[PDB]
């Protein structure tokens, strides 16, 4: 179902593509996984610690 | 640690047939001069002199 949802849009089938570096501008040797993950900020701040 | 030894294992192995193999190099400086312009692969069965 996730492969069908990936193929329904203009996305690759395997879910992983290649991307160029930002420091030099050249390409990579192995394709990486790019996506959107939901994150959350914890209450363990740095102002109350140091 | 977990980040250094992975790159050192990816760097220090070999495969069957890659581009830029079979040629003879002079020293380590010739390897560093021929690697950065992408005329040879990262791993190839070559004969160098050290």
């Amino acid at each position: 179902e996730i492969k069908r949802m990936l193929e329904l849009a203009d996305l690759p089938q395997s879910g992983q593509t290649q991307l160029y570096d930002g420091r030099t501008g050249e390409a990579f040797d192995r394709k990486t996984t790019v996506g959107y993950m939901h994150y959350l900020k914890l209450n363990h701040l740095v102002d109350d610690k140091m | 640690s977990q980040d250094v030894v992975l790159g050192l294992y990816y760097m220090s192995r070999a495969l069957e047939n890659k581009k830029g193999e079979g040629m003879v190099f002079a020293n380590t400086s010739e390897v560093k001069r021929a690697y950065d312009n992408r005329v040879v692969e990262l791993h190839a069965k070559v004969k160098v002199r050290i």
Binding site: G35, M37, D47 | S1
Partner: protein, 223 residues
């Protein structure tokens, strides 16, 4: 955490802190009115607020939502933000469960929360004499006396820095008084949103307490 409509109907009036709903003739004479909570202090010094989402002239049903609270969406739970993820070792920065960021996470106002810190200052009576909140404070320059009012309380919505004076208070020792003013903790800056004064019965109120009382009776007469 979110307000729910007890009886569906037509939204007559709406505001940033008040929702007026008209009860229809099916589930009916007195219409209901809701008061959304504004930026107050929670138990863990976290700012909470409720913002509405409906518009005027809408027809709602019984059990629907009207205002989303802190970390709340249109009817689903929403804790944080969605960002791009690339699993790759980037120059040894992601060494052991380490996370690299970008400039566009910071500059787009993504993970900047609001913390509310409470500070108190009491004034009791010792064996010498009672302490006052007067403005004639010795050894205080004009760089900190400009934020203080005539009553000794800093103005609402005034920007305060770390180490400034907000509540002026003197203690008599024996003309010659000792400075016991409430100081700001270091590294913390921000505006003063609410000022609450708790006075004792039998004591005459000052100008700030009278201003708070007249604003309170004007607001309660308005609602």
């Amino acid at each position: 955490v979110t307000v729910n409509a007890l009886r569906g109907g037509v939204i007559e009036q709406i505001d940033a802190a008040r929702i007026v709903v008209k009860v229809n003739e099916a589930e009916i004479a007195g219409v209901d009115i809701y008061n959304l909570i504004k930026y107050t202090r929670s138990n863990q010094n976290t700012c909470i607020n409720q913002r509405p989402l409906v518009n005027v002239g809408d027809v709602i049903a019984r059990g629907d939502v009207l205002a989303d609270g802190p970390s709340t969406d249109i009817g689903e739970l929403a804790l944080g933000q969605n960002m791009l993820i690339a699993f790759m070792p980037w120059n040894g920065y992601n060494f052991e469960d380490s996370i690299l960021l970008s400039e566009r996470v910071v500059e787009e106002d993504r993970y900047t929360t609001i913390h509310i810190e409470e500070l108190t200052c009491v004034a009791r009576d010792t064996k010498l004499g009672p302490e006052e909140i007067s403005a004639d404070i010795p050894n205080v320059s004009e760089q900190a006396l400009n934020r203080l009012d005539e009553s000794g309380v800093v103005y609402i919505g005034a920007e305060v820095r770390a180490g400034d004076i907000m509540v002026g208070k003197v203690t008599p020792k024996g003309s010659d008084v000792k400075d016991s003013s409430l100081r700001v903790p270091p590294g913390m800056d921000g505006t003063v949103i609410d000022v609450q004064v708790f006075t004792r019965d039998g004591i005459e109120k000052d100008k700030r307490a009278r201003q708070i009382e007249e604003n309170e009776i004007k607001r309660v007469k308005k609602d």
